[PDB]
């Protein structure tokens, strides 16, 4: 009720042993009343690491997207050693959204590592049951086995009607996903853990389809980008193996579904100025016949007997021997180019004179023609170059023209394909212009480059006039905080870009930009500026392969950065970057990598690896950081995964107030925006959620002063949220959330929620279950409020009540007594947290009334087992409002799975194999349904204290020869766990 505090564990320990005498009654009662629940004491079980590898085949659906709406691939297993380390070998094959699938090694939700199928963005198949949202859905297949060696799993995805179907050895898998959101590009993905060798049959060159694809399903090898060569890589990696060592890698940029939609700049909407004819004729005359200039007597000599139809591709007629209605299309063509120039804001220059004054009619002696004599019809107009502004300008001309053509082709029904199939309306060139290969780009734009340099020769030289996941901060553990001496640590810039590097205090904020506040002293080498509570130019921009020295000396209270063994002087010329630096808590190596950035954080584990150290740092008196440190230095990376954390009392903008004991008003937690209508007002979408869940029953059975018998027979619970006066109901969203809700959307609405309907299959094809899973079961307050209500000055103070019922798993929402049509029916053993996602529009925003209704027990009786039959509303200190914080720290694992990926053969296809088993001990928080690393407690000292006192309670309750209690404790703490904790050095 009050919460996790170690003093109650101290009391429980004092209950057991008294002056060296064991009280058997207390030792048995504490065990029986605490251990079996497994909901209050942190649990530790050893699990396996899970690593996912994708073929980077990103396909999707959008309004006008060039991508095809059906795809199919295969994965077949070569070897599986099941149960290699006394745990299920995590093997899963399926699709996954490119925006939302973040299978970071270690940690994760549930009781284990996450693969494809442990999140509502990825949908996998274990061979026996489907996986989505971290739950197993048993399906009917002829094999009824987990995918074993010499077994092929076919997987197809249809976007037009969203459906992912699986097939085991040519036998259809009954039960498919449906109605999943298409926001983002799906890609094939397998999670293999350890002791698994699989291979991707993508069809065509990349493997062979052992089973024929279903009709209408294109092979996945026909979706590789033209500019990109097919490969296999992890979904997202914060560390990549390299020659010098572990290369820390920042967040990567993935293509969005909006990129594949070719919306061009409209050119026919604008009218032409009265100068239309003048530029049009001069531009048209040459462009009529440049191709003739390039093809007469070099291609196929034209004959007047025919018309460019029997090996006569060029033609030289300035009189336009082809029909004039056909020919004046070229005049209207140059007019259209003028319209496009107007759309891009290009005017009529006349900077130079007429180019015909310096016209050099270039008719080579080799080039000649019978008809119309031999004359150079194209206007060479001597020579003229292209200004770089005009090269980028003609680049966007070609971009706009190709986007117009691509949009028109999409309207016709064309789609992108690696291998061109004209009858199937498939070709490799309708991908958007930035997605076009460079050869296609230049082949598009060469003619317009000639035309635009002709325009410049005429004289028309007219110019055309946070997500918290674009920086990744890697810092040392707070355990290695140095407070004295001189330390040196190198940082190599493998990829040039925004890669801040320096020394940070241990209280470094996760989402705050590195060096923006006073908690860091960093150097931005991309543009050359030192950052600490601001920015100032310093040093010089670096290049690829450059190493920064990053020395601190706290004897002199200064920080020095050196580039390639040369001290970076400041703008004033002083050698030291920062001066007069208090020691404070301490300093830690730190580096924030930007998007698509690679940096080698070379701490001084060995001076042999430390290059340029003797050049700068061995002489000056700087000890290398971690010189004698036997084990590798442990790092912490900004996880960039939204996590629900308690609202800080000292939050500059948000306040939570507890009011209780009122005769009419029940206990309640209200939210107040402290500084509203001020210079610093945050209208960001605040995601608030109560700390404790209301778990649903294991089996969903059919089951004025209030009636006591009904009160004891009640399985429904009431909970209201009152929206304060002046707060818009159009900005509130009242309901429930699952413990795996990770969505910090700044413009969140009801259509952004994760929702996948697993429709079970029967042999005849008719549906069996059709069970829906959703991430948050919420209802918009704008739906309750009547349209047309404006200002909110009526002070309605609408309350939204959530009548949940655990015996049937059914929740229904009400507003001011008016029943709402929004009803939800969920699975058994589901944990729902009360939650409101509100955009603040008033000084007082919302308030959680934890009250009750007629013949309905309050939510305290739902969360708290000790108050199971208590109908009086109450709120102990554990029940607190928590905000969705965007970024939190995460320990980098000491070792990662070594996965060998390579193309086995031209017909075998790409293959992925892992043979090294890695195990970690997981600290599972029961009520939140998330497991951290047991080593991650080295910096979270409150959980460390609680777990240490929990272990001490275990020892006290099994002490003095309690063999029965020791046997009871062996279930919670296994022999493998004990041996792994003994051997673990971190």
């Amino acid at each position, epitope marked *: 009720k009050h919460g996790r505090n170690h003093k109650v564990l101290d009391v429980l320990c004092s209950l057991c042993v008294c002056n060296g005498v064991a009280v058997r009654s207390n030792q048995d009662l504490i065990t029986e009343n605490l251990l079996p629940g497994r909901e209050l004491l942190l649990q530790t079980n050893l699990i396996n690491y899970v690593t996912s590898i994708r073929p980077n085949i990103f396909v999707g659906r959008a309004e006008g997207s060039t991508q095809y709406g059906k795809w199919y691939f295969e994965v077949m297993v070569d070897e599986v050693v099941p149960f290699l380390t006394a745990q299920a070998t995590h093997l899963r094959v399926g699709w996954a959204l490119t925006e939302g699938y973040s299978p970071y090694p270690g940690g994760g939700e549930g009781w284990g590592g996450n693969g494809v199928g442990d999140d509502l963005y990825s949908y996998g198949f274990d061979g026996l049951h489907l996986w989505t949202g971290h739950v197993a859905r048993p399906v009917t297949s002829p094999g009824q086995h987990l995918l074993a060696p010499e077994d092929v799993v076919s997987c197809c995805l249809d976007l037009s009607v969203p459906s992912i179907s699986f097939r085991i050895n040519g036998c259809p898998v009954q039960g498919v996903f449906e109605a999943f959101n298409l926001d983002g590009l799906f890609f094939p993905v397998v999670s293999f853990s350890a002791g698994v060798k699989v291979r991707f049959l993508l069809g065509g060159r990349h493997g062979e389809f052992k089973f024929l694809p279903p009709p209408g399903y294109a092979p996945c090898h026909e979706a590789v980008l033209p500019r990109e060569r097919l490969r296999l890589e992890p979904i997202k990696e914060y560390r990549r193996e390299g020659p010098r060592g572990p290369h820390l890698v920042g967040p990567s940029r993935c293509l969005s579904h909006t990129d594949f939609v070719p919306c061009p700049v409209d050119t026919v909407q604008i009218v032409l100025p009265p100068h239309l004819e003048r530029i049009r004729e001069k531009l048209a005359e040459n462009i009529h016949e440049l191709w003739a200039l390039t093809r007469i007597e070099q291609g196929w000599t034209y004959g007047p007997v025919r018309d460019d139809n029997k090996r006569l591709h060029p033609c030289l007629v300035n009189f336009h021997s082809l029909p004039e209605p056909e020919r004046n299309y070229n005049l209207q*063509m140059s007019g259209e180019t003028l319209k496009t120039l107007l759309a891009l804001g290009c005017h009529v220059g006349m900077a130079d004179e007429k180019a015909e004054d310096n016209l050099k009619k270039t008719k080579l002696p080799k080039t000649y023609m019978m008809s119309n004599g031999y004359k150079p019809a194209p206007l060479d107009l001597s020579h003229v170059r292209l200004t770089p502004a005009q090269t980028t300008l003609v680049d966007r001309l070609a971009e706009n023209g190709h986007n117009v053509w691509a949009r028109d082709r999409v309207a016709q029904g064309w789609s992108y394909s690696a291998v061109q199939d004209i009858p199937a309306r498939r070709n490799p*060139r309708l991908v958007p212009y930035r997605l076009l290969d460079e050869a296609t780009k230049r082949s*598009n734009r060469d003619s317009l480059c000639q035309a635009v340099r002709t325009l410049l020769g005429y004289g028309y030289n007219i110019e055309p006039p946070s997500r918290w996941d674009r920086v990744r901060i890697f810092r040392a553990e707070k355990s290695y905080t140095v407070q004295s001496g001189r330390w040196y640590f190198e940082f190599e810039a493998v990829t040039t870009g925004e890669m801040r590097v320096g020394w940070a205090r241990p209280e470094l904020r996760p989402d705050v930009e590195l060096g923006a506040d006073e908690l860091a002293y960093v150097f931005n080498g991309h543009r050359g500026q030192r950052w600490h509570l601001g920015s100032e130019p310093f040093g010089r921009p670096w290049q690829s392969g450059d190493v920064v020295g990053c020395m601190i000396d706290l004897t002199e209270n200064t920080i020095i950065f050196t580039l390639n063994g040369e001290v970076l002087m400041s703008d004033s010329g002083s050698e030291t970057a920062f001066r007069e630096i208090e020691i404070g808590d301490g300093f830690l190596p730190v580096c924030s990598l930007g998007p698509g950035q690679v940096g080698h954080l070379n701490l001084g584990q060995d001076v042999s690896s430390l290059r340029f150290f003797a050049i700068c740092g061995l002489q000056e008196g700087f000890e290398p950081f971690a010189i004698n440190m036997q084990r590798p230095v442990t790092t912490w990376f900004s996880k960039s995964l939204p996590q629900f954390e308690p609202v800080p009392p000292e939050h500059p903008h948000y306040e939570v107030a507890r009011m209780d004991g009122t005769v009419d008003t029940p206990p309640c937690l209200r939210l107040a925006h402290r500084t509203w209508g001020s210079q610093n007002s945050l209208v960001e979408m605040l995601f608030l959620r109560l700390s404790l869940p209301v778990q649903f029953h294991q089996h969903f059975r059919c089951t004025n002063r209030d009636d006591p018998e009904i009160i004891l027979n009640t399985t429904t619970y009431y909970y209201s949220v009152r929206v304060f006066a002046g707060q818009e109901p159009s900005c509130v969203w009242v309901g429930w959330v699952t413990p795996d809700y990770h969505q910090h959307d700044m413009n969140f609405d009801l259509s952004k929620v994760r929702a996948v309907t697993v429709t079970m299959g029967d042999e005849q094809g008719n549906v069996h279950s059709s069970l829906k899973c959703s991430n948050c079961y919420m209802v918009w307050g704008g739906d309750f409020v009547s349209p047309g209500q404006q200002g909110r000055i009526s002070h309605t103070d609408l309350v939204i009540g959530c009548l949940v019922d655990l015996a049937t798993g059914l929740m229904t929402f009400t507003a001011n007594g008016k029943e709402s049509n929004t009803f939800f029916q969920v699975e058994p053993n589901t944990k729902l947290f009360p939650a409101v996602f509100v955009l603040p529009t008033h000084q007082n925003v919302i308030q959680f009334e934890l009250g009750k209704q007629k013949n309905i027990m309050p939510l305290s009786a739902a969360m708290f087992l000790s108050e199971r039959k208590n109908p009086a509303p109450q709120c102990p200190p554990r029940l607190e409002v928590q905000m969705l914080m965007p970024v939190s720290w995460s320990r980098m694992p000491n070792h990662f799975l070594q996965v060998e990926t390579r193309r086995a053969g031209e017909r075998l296809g790409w293959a992925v194999q892992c043979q090294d088993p890695l195990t970690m001990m997981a600290l599972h928080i029961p009520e939140e349904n998330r497991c951290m690393d047991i080593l991650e407690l080295s910096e979270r000292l409150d959980l460390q204290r609680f777990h240490s006192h929990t272990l001490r309670l275990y020892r006290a309750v099994c002490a003095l020869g309690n063999n029965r209690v020791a046997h009871a404790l062996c279930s919670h703490v296994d022999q493998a766990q004990l041996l792994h904790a003994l051997e673990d050095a971190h």
Partner: nanobody
Amino acid sequence: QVQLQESGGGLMQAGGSLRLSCTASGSIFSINSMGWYRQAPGKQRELVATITSGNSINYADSVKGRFTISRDNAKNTVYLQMNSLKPEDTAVYYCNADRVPNGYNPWGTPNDEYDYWGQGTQVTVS
């Protein structure tokens, strides 16, 4: 938007009259130098002569037999007479309308491929 409704396709023996009609329904843009890419079954689309706006007959690879091709200016329907049917003439005739003039292209690949290619009909011919 410019969809070409090619109609006909009745099975006639060699030497039977087959006047077929491709109704080029759509915008006036991308309508000239339009040709019947008759895709032979399993064997690719040979181009029938290419007539531009104004009936400019330009002989192409498949001009084997009779091939009287004439586009109505107002009705915007190409009438292609196939009296001299041949075993080589059996194909799904697929008329495509483009804006590039025949053998006369100041653009490059974007407009070279900028053709409203509509669905034809299977002219099965003995």
